Design an enzyme around this catalytic site. Structure first.
Site, PDB file in Angstrom:
ATOM      1  N   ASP A  35     -45.019  49.583 -29.929  1.00  0.00           N
ATOM      2  CA  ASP A  35     -44.209  48.767 -30.073  1.00  0.00           C
ATOM      3  C   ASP A  35     -44.453  47.472 -29.478  1.00  0.00           C
ATOM      4  O   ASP A  35     -44.075  47.040 -28.658  1.00  0.00           O
ATOM      5  CB  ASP A  35     -42.665  49.302 -30.188  1.00  0.00           C
ATOM      6  CG  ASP A  35     -41.526  48.372 -30.585  1.00  0.00           C
ATOM      7  OD1 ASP A  35     -41.627  47.546 -31.064  1.00  0.00           O
ATOM      8  OD2 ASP A  35     -40.411  48.466 -30.023  1.00  0.00           O
ATOM      9  N   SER A 199     -45.721  32.348 -41.053  1.00  0.00           N
ATOM     10  CA  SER A 199     -46.801  32.696 -42.271  1.00  0.00           C
ATOM     11  C   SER A 199     -46.116  31.398 -43.042  1.00  0.00           C
ATOM     12  O   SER A 199     -45.652  30.897 -43.325  1.00  0.00           O
ATOM     13  CB  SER A 199     -45.957  33.661 -42.967  1.00  0.00           C
ATOM     14  OG  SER A 199     -46.617  33.693 -44.169  1.00  0.00           O
TER      15      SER A 199
END
Length: 330
Positions: A35, A199
């Protein structure tokens, strides 16, 4: 040193991925959920409340000659999906794919919430976010990666998740045969303890690319792609019959649909998520309503590039002095 381990979807939907991990002496092999959005290595154990164990493999520290109680240390964690676990702590030898760390904090669960109990395939979590998020008190502990780092050939790990197929976590090297083209690296902020990056935009299907900054985290422990409501609405507007359902808890779409792809930007590069990756199947067994793999982050408080996004790429988690993230097509 290096390590290399195969990671395998737990079910037909790729809800999560498990990777075998050796703990203790002699080795006890547990299948852990790696994770990159948390920083605790915790396991089902001989200390876990019996009624909360349902098929998991447990770690038994009393059977390990290298286990030592970390006296006084406790831990307690709550995740974004509302699940939780807590317990006490041992140090022991932990190996992943041939890479060994001695003295790793292994957090033994005394209690786990129902979602963990109900998932018989996940024997615990191995956190790979920054150690500043580790929950051990009163002495915060380091992640497996942080402990291994100085011994690694290169201070990196990579995630190469499969779509309905196994994939690989590598530590200490970049497998240049595992991706196509070049790797595009992008800046990371560690201020929130995550692999947080920005992004450069998105496209829906064959549509034009929208240049827009989207801050979010690379999180292998989250199944879906969670993005701003504007972006998600633009995606689902291209699917006939798709709608957001408060009763179901997100966007659903007719199972007869063919889903468009979704592209996200990494600098000037582009990662394309095929439409099939966005299908999470019937909302309930036999339903003709299907659950979407792109969902709104509104009310989460952060955008999450979860498995839906990451499995479309070869992803480099660069833990050099200035951390960065790399993405390549594959």
């Amino acid at each position: 040193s290096t390590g290399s381990a195969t990671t395998t979807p737990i079910d037909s939907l790729d809800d999560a991925y498990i990777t075998p991990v050796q703990i203790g002496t002699p080795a006890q092999t547990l299948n852990l959920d790696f994770d990159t959005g948390s920083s605790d290595l915790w396991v089902f154990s001989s200390e876990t409340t019996a009624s909360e164990v349902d098929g998991q493999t447990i770690y038994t520290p009393s059977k390990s000659t290298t286990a030592k109680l970390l006296s006084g240390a406790t831990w307690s964690i709550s995740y974004g999906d509302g699940s939780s676990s807590s317990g006490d702590v041992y140090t022991d030898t932990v190996s992943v794919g041939g890479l060994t760390v001695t003295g790793q904090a292994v957090e033994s669960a005394k209690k786990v919430s129902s979602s963990f109990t109900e998932d018989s395939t996940i024997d615990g979590l191995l956190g790979l976010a920054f150690s500043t998020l580790n929950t051990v008190s009163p002495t915060q502990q380091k992640t497996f990666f942080d402990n291994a780092k100085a011994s690694l050939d290169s201070p990196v790990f990579t995630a190469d998740l499969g779509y309905h197929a196994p994939g690989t976590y590598n530590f200490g090297f970049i497998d240049t045969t595992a991706y196509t083209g070049s790797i595009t690296y992008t800046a990371v902020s560690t201020k929130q303890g995550f692999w947080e990056w920005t992004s450069t935009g998105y496209a829906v299907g064959s549509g034009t690319f929208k240049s827009t900054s989207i801050d979010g985290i690379a999180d292998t422990g989250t199944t879906l792609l969670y993005l701003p409501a504007t972006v998600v609405s633009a995606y689902w507007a291209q699917v006939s019959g798709a709608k957001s359902s408060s009763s179901v808890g997100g966007y659903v779409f007719p199972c007869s649909a063919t889903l468009p792809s979704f592209t996200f930007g990494v600098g000037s590069a582009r990662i394309v998520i095929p439409g099939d990756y966005i299908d999470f199947g019937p909302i309930s067994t036999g339903s003709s309503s299907c659950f979407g793999g792109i969902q709104s982050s509104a009310g989460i408080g952060i955008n999450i590039f979860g498995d839906v996004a990451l499995k479309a790429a070869f992803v480099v988690f660069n833990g050099a002095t200035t951390p960065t993230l790399g993405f390549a097509s594959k």
